[PDB]
């Protein structure tokens, strides 16, 4: 059995955390062009911004 | 046949490219660079 919580203020703010994130400035397509083996082919795309995360 | 016959076709040959575990790669002199061979991301099988 688990329980979890989340402390916020009595304003109802939540101040005792802090989220940062990675800006992004540009994507590309991993793989460049590709040409599918067959027509009835499928392939599954992947994106990467400049600090390479997977978007 | 004969002994004196050209060599035939090895059924283990036969069945081991009907598994298609054998490893296939990219040809490393070609330019631009190839797209990966289909073998060469087959998924794991489920069984055996």
Same mark, same amino acid.
């Given at each position: 059995?688990?329980?979890?919580? &989340?402390?916020?203020?009595?304003?109802? %703010?939540? &101040?005792?955390?802090?989220?940062?994130?990675?800006?992004? %400035? %540009?994507?590309?397509?991993?793989?460049?062009?590709?040409?599918?083996? $067959?027509?009835?082919? $499928?392939?599954?795309?992947?994106?990467?911004?400049?600090?390479?995360?997977? &978007? | 046949?004969?002994?004196?016959?050209?060599?035939? *076709?090895?059924?283990?040959?036969?069945?081991?490219?009907?598994?298609?575990?054998?490893?296939?790669?990219?040809?490393?002199?070609?330019?631009?660079?190839?797209? *990966?061979?289909?073998?060469?991301?087959?998924?794991?099988? *489920?069984?055996?």
């Amino acid at each position: 059995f688990t329980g979890r919580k &989340v402390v916020t203020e009595v304003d109802g %703010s939540f &101040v005792r955390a802090v989220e940062l994130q990675l800006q992004a %400035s %540009s994507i590309t397509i991993v793989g460049g062009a590709f040409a599918l083996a $067959t027509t009835t082919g $499928t392939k599954q795309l992947k994106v990467r911004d400049d600090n390479g995360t997977d &978007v | 046949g004969l002994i004196s016959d050209p060599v035939e *076709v090895d059924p283990i040959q036969v069945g081991r490219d009907e598994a298609g575990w054998v490893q296939e790669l990219r040809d490393r002199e070609a330019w631009p660079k190839q797209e *990966v061979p289909e073998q060469a991301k087959k998924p794991a099988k *489920v069984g055996n």
